[PDB]
Structure formats: structure tokens, C-alpha cells
Design a protein around this ligand. Structure first.
Ligand SMILES: [Cl-]
Ligand SMILES: [Cl-]
Ligand code: NA
Lengths: 217, 220, 218, 219
């Protein structure tokens, strides 16, 4: 049917940059028919928020750096000077049809200067060890860019396949990421080895950083 | 004080049915229209249904037509979404929203959303373990809680019952090969505070009715 | 562009009949676009009143004999049991477009039993004759059906082109009409002649009826 | 007691301007949308304009774009239609209406309408002449209201006390460019010696009021 094709699917820009997102109605629609295009912003973990309605009206309370415009069946949302807090996925919505449809969304990412991670390592707790499993956690806090390599070593054996990483979404104040890597071992294996080391490589570190502990110290 | 608050989400078997509720306050639904919109994990928004409560008029997306039913009960200022014959592709956060004023075609207030997970697997409540500050960077230490082996999503974590928000990172959950989820929440704090400031992670996993408050501190 | 066409453009039906009026979009429209068709009733000298909205909902307070429905791009208003008070023009309205547009209207008239007019003729007043003009008036009162013919004669000369008629709107209680025919003459012409006569032809009269007067006779 | 009351219609020359008002009571226009619709004499309804007063959003029919402007004053709960460069074919009764609740696409309350006549002709009040009942049946009598411009004229009988059997005819336009109408009533023949019959004519556009007593002519 009638749909909105939103582009680009993602973009990045620096704070202070002007950014433009476009929605085009998938077909030629008569000009007698109104679309009442809305735009919504969705931050991580949160419901969408209304930014612009009826093509170009700024919703109450929305910063004036947001604006909408429409011409024919092409619609744009413009952020005149990107702020860190504008990290989000933005969606257009058309009401030519009932039901109305949403565009596919545009992820806006923030470019900023390189920031090295602070790194921390956490032994398994004694409480967890009682249950039969040992989780070792390495934390990389507030870094940019997202790319990072974390390597686990147990008495100098490279661990492979037995860790999982999780990365936060870019922070709405400083535009950094954080990352956890969790190494899972059986209690019996945790207890056969001594040295636990997390080695971290990232563009902001001139060489790799290791954090380690010795079991039982 | 305009608000919409969903409830009723959680786990349901494929084939099963679930009913969501959207409770409004600060306005009457009689005066407006109510909508449901959903979002599958990592995907975009999909419109689901709409109702004009005053006269019962309803419309539905094709994808749910014949299985979902939207309704409302104006004496309780509440709207509902009855979902039947659920399949994996119905797994999503479901939001309700409204139009306000006579501002049609603009969803101005939305609820917080509620996750519906369609799966054969059973519920399992998590264990909460400390990530004890050893560790330290400058005079900054990190600490946290590891929330391990739960199903389905979601878990929420807060620190010191909402009083501690700065420097908190709660990580997106990871799905382990066991089919259970696990997450950590960490916070950076001053090393000097460790002796005297209490840090407690408040963990809640509604699907298993598991609430835990765990004090995290320097070991031995 | 999109327009609605109603049909019929007028109709007559008896009290207690079931009447249906149609409204058709002038082109194919995707199912995904809603028309939110409304129907209004407009009586003589009044603002329209809303009857049906969003295709089939009955507006509050409207009698239940009114109902609407729509299959695709074709919409129907139905009056289930026509009442004399339902004499009106009925309009549909489509909201596919902005601006929305109205249909061209369907005039509904109540069929009742034939009723012959009572016929009256009025000479001009002496007050008017002072002014230089004479109006002679023929009145046909409370008749059905609306069609009627009136012919003016002045000393047996048929008058053509110097008269105008006016007809009331169908009465909302008895479903009859009334009609006036006014013949305009100069004062001098009026005074040159004697017999003024209006001859009325109507289905309720078995042959034409004449009323007349002689100028100057009481 | 939701209500819309229009005013400001009257006669105006081609190329002139006029401002209509729609005063709302029993609801706030802040809450909703207000529309104008017109109807030329003998014709159908034509949508003219709409406004959402809270943000000033407006839409117009093509036939009035550039000439007409719809506006609102929410502090006076009034909407307006400013009409410029008027032409003959703008001549019509103009109605304002609303949407209520969040019931879009349904004009639930309408005003009574106000007539706008776009013409070069001058205002002229009417002459009123009797239609005298002639010689235990029913008799007819009436008033002929002749030669006025513009519309409208109203007629009542005995100040509103006589309404049964009254027919006031639609006006006709004469070739002079002036209107004329009659109003008649039927009454019992036996009432003619004794009951007084007076037609009350008001042509507001020329401020002409006339009460005309109508009786059997003597001979
Ligand atoms: Cl919407
Ligand atoms: Cl409308
Ligand atoms: Na005969």
C-alpha cells in the first residue's frame, strides 16, 4: 500500500552539526489527500516522544532546533544543531491511510573525540561459587569509539568461546559507550587456576591495558 | 499528570492469549482516542489498533486483524488489548498512547511499554551476586550487581532506591546458550566513599515475582 | 479529483415507505484510505443537521428510522419508515480529501393522496393603483401533487410572459403545497379591461376551474 | 446550549469586503475546530474553510483562496471569515459549524446562517398592499410585499398570534431587479366582520417595518 520510505537508516554527526532526515510517500498520492506527517524521537529503553505534527508544527515543549517541513510527498525533519542528548532513533508517521504507518526509522549517532576506557575486573563472588559457577567480569567504562577488543587469559591460556559482551547505547551526556565482558567458568576450573587477566585494546590507549587478579588474594 | 500506565505483559505460550491494560489518569479516555503500537526486539514501530471509546469504533492493522481486539471501559478510564493466538513474531514491547485535544494524528502521550514474550520456555527467577569494589581507577572505584540466569526479560535495576543515578550503567541483557538471560549493572563511585556510603542494587524481575535488594561492599 | 455523486437527485415516496439514497465516489480509491462519510438533512430555511457519521453511526438524538451503510466506495442512507416531517434535501459528505466535499443533494418529497386546490383571485388594491401598477393575484391553496397550471385571461386574451409564480415548500405536517400566480399590468391597461380570470388545471380537479372578477364590481 | 451565532452578513458591492463572525457559547473554540460552509440561492452546500484555533492551522476551498481568511480569537470565543474581492457568485447564506468531542469529520452543531448578497443594486424597502378577502366557509386574505432589495423580508400575522393556515411565499425576483412576495392566510368566513387581521412586515436591510391591516373592501 501507501508507505513511507525513510532515509538514511543511520547517520552520524558532530555536536553543532545540522542533520536532516527524509521520509517519502512510497507512491504518487493525489494532492487533495492530506498526510498529516508526524515525527517521533525514541531514546533507548523509552517510549517514543512526539516532536513534530501535521508536517511542520513543533509540539509543545520540544526544543526549537527541531523542525519539520513537507513538499509534495517528501518530508523532512531537521535538527539545526545536534546536541548529545539527541542520540536516538527517529520515526516519521503518515496518516494518508487508516491505519497510519511509520517509517522504518533513522538512527542518529554522535561523533566525538577519542576517549580511552577505564578498565576494571571483578572476581566471582563467594556466594556464586557456592552454586557451582564462576563469572569473571571485565568492565570498560566511558570510551569512544565503540570498537574495542577484550581478551581473557587464565594462567596465560587465551579463553575463546566462553565469554559474552554487552555494550551500552551511546550516553546522552558525553556520547561514550561502556562494555562488559563476562567469562563463565565451572567452579572446579576456576579453582584450578590462579591468574585471571582481562586485556583491553582500544584506539585511545597507546598500548593494551591488562587488569588481573590472583584467585584468593 | 496526564499519564498512561500499561500492565499485563510477560510470558505466554505460542497459541496462548494475553490481555493488556492501559490505565489513564489526568484526562478521560471518553474525550479522546486510544492506540496500541508495538516494537519487536531491535525493530521499528508497528501500529496495532485504535479505538474511540465514546462509541466503540475500532480499527486494526492487517497483521493482527482477527486475533486482537481492542476495547475500552470508560467507567474505569482504562483500555485493553486482548491478544489471541500469539506467535513468536508477536514478541514485542506494546505501548499505548492517545491523541489529545482535537489534535488528531499525533500521539502526544505514550505509556512506558510492556514486554510480551511468546515462548514455550518456563519462567526462571534470577540470582543476584555482587561485583565488589576491590575495583579502583584513580580515586574512582567500580562496583555492581550481576543478575544471572532469568527468563523471560525484563529485569530492572536501580541503585539505592533511585537515589543513585550518576555513573550507573545497566547493560543490555545477554542470552546465554542455556536459553537464560543475564545482565550486570555497575556504578562508578569515589574510592573514599567506600568505607561509609552504602550501595544497594534493587533488582526486580516481575515475571518470577523476584525482588531483591543487595548490598555491595569491599570483600573481607 | 474525488467527488460524491448521489442518486437519485430527487424522489417521492409515501409515508411508511423505506427510502434509500446512494452516494458514490467518482473514482476508485484504495481501501487503505477512509472516507468517514457523513449524511446531513436540510429543511427549507434551516441549517443542515447531522444524521449519520463515519459511515454508519447514528448521531445522538436522531430517530432510529435513519441508518447508513457503506460497501467499499458506495454509501447508502436509508430511511426505514418515511415520515411527513422527512421532507428535506439530504447531502452526503466525503472526507477522503481535504477539503471534504458534499454530494449534490437528493430532494425527498412525501407522496400523499391527491388533493385539489382551493382557488382564490385578488384584484389589485386602490392603494397600489395610485402608484401606477396593478398586481392581480391568484392563489391555489393546499394541494397535492405540486404540478399545476394557471392561465391568466384579461377580457379573454390569454396572458403570456407577464406573470410569475411562487410555490411554498411542501408542508411538513399535511404534505401539501400552495402556489401564487401574480400578473403584473400597468395601471392604464388594468383600467382598459373588465374581466380578469385565472383558470386552474390540477389532477385533483376533474376539469379546469376559473375564478374571476370584473373590474369595479363589488 | 452549545450554540453558534453568526453575524455580519449584508449587501456589499462587487470587489468589496465583509467580515463574518461566529460567536460560540456553551463550549470553547480552543477545544475544537470551526468551519464555514455556504449555500448559494437554490444550490447545494459548498465547503469554504476550516481552522484549528489553538494553533491557527487553516485550510480553504480553491474557490476562495487568496480572497478569504478564516481566523479566530479564542479570548472572545469567536471565529471570523474575512472576505475580500467579493464577486456575485459569492452570494450565499454562510454557515459556521464545528466538530465536537474528538469526533472528527462530523459537523454536529451549526449556526443559523447569515446572508451575503454581492451586488451593485441599492437597498430598497417594500410597499405593502392588501389582498382583501372577497365576497360559513373559509376565506383567504393576505399581503403583497412588493419591490424590495436585497433579501430577506419576514412576515408574521397579528404579531405572531395567527400562525395556522399562514403561507408566506418564497420571493420572486422581478425583471426590475427587485423582489416581491406575498403572505396569505385562510380563516373562517364568519370571522371577517369581527376579527382583526394585520400582517407584520419587516425588511431589516432597509430598516422598514410596516403593519398592514387587511379587511373586506367596502362597496
Ligand atoms: Cl496517529
Ligand atoms: Cl467535516
Ligand atoms: Na368544467
Amino acid at each position: 500500500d501507501i508507505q513511507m520510505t525513510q532515509s538514511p537508516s543511520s547517520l552520524s554527526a558532530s555536536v553543532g552539526d545540522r542533520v536532516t532526515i527524509t521520509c517519502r510517500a512510497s507512491q504518487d498520492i493525489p494532492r487533495s489527500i492530506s498526510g498529516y506527517v508526524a515525527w517521533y524521537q525514541q531514546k533507548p529503553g523509552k517510549a517514543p516522544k512526539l516532536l513534530i505534527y501535521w508536517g511542520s508544527y513543533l509540539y509543545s515543549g520540544v526544543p526549537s532546533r527541531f523542525s519539520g517541513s513537507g513538499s509534495g510527498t517528501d518530508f523532512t525533519l531537521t535538527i539545526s544543531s545536534l546536541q548529545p542528548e539527541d542520540f536516538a532513533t527517529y520515526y516519521c508517521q503518515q496518516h494518508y491511510t487508516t491505519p497510519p504507518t511509520f517509517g522504518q526509522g533513522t538512527k542518529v549517532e554522535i561523533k566525538r573525540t577519542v576517549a580511552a576506557p577505564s578498565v576494571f575486573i571483578f572476581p566471582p563472588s563467594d556466594e556464586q561459587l557456592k552454586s557451582g559457577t564462576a563469572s569473571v567480569v571485565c568492565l570498560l567504562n566511558n570510551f569512544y569509539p565503540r570498537e574495542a577488543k577484550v581478551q581473557w587469559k587464565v594462567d596465560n591460556a587465551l579463553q575463546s568461546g566462553n565469554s559474552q559482551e554487552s555494550v551500552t547505547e551511546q550516553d546522552s551526556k558525553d556520547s561514550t559507550y561502556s562494555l562488559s565482558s563476562t567469562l563463565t567458568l565451572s567452579k572446579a576450573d576456576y579453582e584450578k587456576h590462579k591468574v585471571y587477566a582481562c586485556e583491553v585494546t582500544h584506539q585511545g590507549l597507546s598500548s593494551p591495558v591488562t587488569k588481573s587478579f590472583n584467585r584468593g588474594e | 499528570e496526564v499519564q498512561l500506565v500499561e500492565s499485563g505483559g510477560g510470558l505466554v505460550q505460542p497459541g496462548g492469549s494475553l490481555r493488556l491494560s492501559c490505565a489513564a489518569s489526568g484526562f478521560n479516555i471518553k474525550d479522546t482516542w486510544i492506540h496500541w503500537v508495538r516494537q519487536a526486539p531491535g525493530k521499528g514501530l508497528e501500529w496495532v489498533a485504535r479505538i474511540y471509546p465514546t462509541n466503540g469504533y475500532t480499527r486494526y492493522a492487517d497483521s493482527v486483524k482477527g486475533r486482537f481486539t481492542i476495547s475500552a471501559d470508560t467507567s474505569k478510564n482504562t483500555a485493553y488489548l486482548q491478544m489471541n493466538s500469539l506467535r513468536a513474531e508477536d514478541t514485542a514491547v506494546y505501548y499505548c498512547s492517545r491523541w489529545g485535544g482535537m489534535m488528531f494524528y499525533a500521539m502526544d502521550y505514550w505509556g512506558q511499554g510492556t514486554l510480551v514474550t511468546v515462548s514455550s520456555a518456563s519462567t526462571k527467577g534470577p540470582s543476584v551476586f555482587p561485583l565488589a569494589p576491590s575495583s579502583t581507577s584513580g580515586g574512582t572505584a567500580a562496583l555492581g550487581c550481576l543478575v544471572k540466569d532469568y527468563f523471560p526479560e525484563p529485569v530492572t535495576v536501580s541503585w539505592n532506591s533511585g537515589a543513585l543515578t550518576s555513573g550507573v550503567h545497566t547493560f543490555p541483557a545477554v542470552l546465554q546458550s542455556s536459553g537464560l538471560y543475564s545482565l550486570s549493572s555497575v556504578v562508578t563511585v569515589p574510592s573514599s566513599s567506600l568505607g561509609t556510603q552504602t550501595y544497594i542494587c534493587n533488582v526486580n524481575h516481575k515475571p518470577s515475582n523476584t525482588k531483591v535488594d543487595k548490598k555491595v561492599e569491599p570483600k573481607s
